[PDB]
Design a protein around this ligand. Structure first.
Ligand SMILES: Cc1cc2nc3c(=O)[nH]c(=O)nc-3n(C[C@H](O)[C@H](O)[C@H](O)COP(=O)(O)O)c2cc1C
Ligand SMILES: [Cl-]
Ligand SMILES: [Co+2]
Ligand SMILES: [Mg+2]
Length: 116
């Protein structure tokens, strides 16, 4: 694929990544073998706003779509702003099946306005 995204399986413990796009490998510098089976939180680090992490936790609990902008880190420790779009995916039976997270790299909203 082209875009940077991961798919998780919420029917398995702690919502592991079951698919990572080529774009996600390139953006994050991790190999597919380093990503499969782990939770999306591994990209976080010291500067990640815990208030934003709570917003994500609530959206996944409530199975609601959300977009947030938060600091994430590549494998080599480079900070990037991640505009992260999380969408629940339901099957034809109305049952949660996946989450997809699409990442866009950039400080789209300036930190001084994000922090207000
Ligand atoms: C499909 C999906 C993709 C995610 N991608 C990211 C990501 O790129 N960066 C990130 O910081 N968190 C990401 N997360 C969020 C974490 O996995 C986690 O839900 C969040 O940190 C809140 O839960 P926690 O407080 O248990 O860590 C993703 C979550 C899901 C479901
Ligand atoms: Cl999660
Ligand atoms: Co591109
Ligand atoms: Mg945490």
């Amino acid at each position: 694929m082209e875009k940077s995204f991961v798919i998780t399986d919420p029917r398995l413990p702690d919502n592991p990544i079951i698919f990572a796009s080529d774009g996600f490998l390139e953006l994050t510098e991790y190999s597919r073998e380093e990503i499969l089976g782990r939770n999306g939180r591994f990209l976080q680090g010291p500067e990640t706003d815990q208030a934003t992490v709570q917003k994500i936790r609530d959206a996944i609990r409530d199975q609601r779509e959300i977009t947030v902008q938060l600091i994430n880190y590549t494998k080599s420790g480079k900070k990037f702003w991640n505009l992260l779009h999380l969408q629940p995916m339901r099957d034809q039976k109305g049952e949660l099946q996946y989450f997809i997270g699409v990442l866009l790299d950039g400080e789209f909203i300036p930190n001084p306005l994000l922090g207000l």
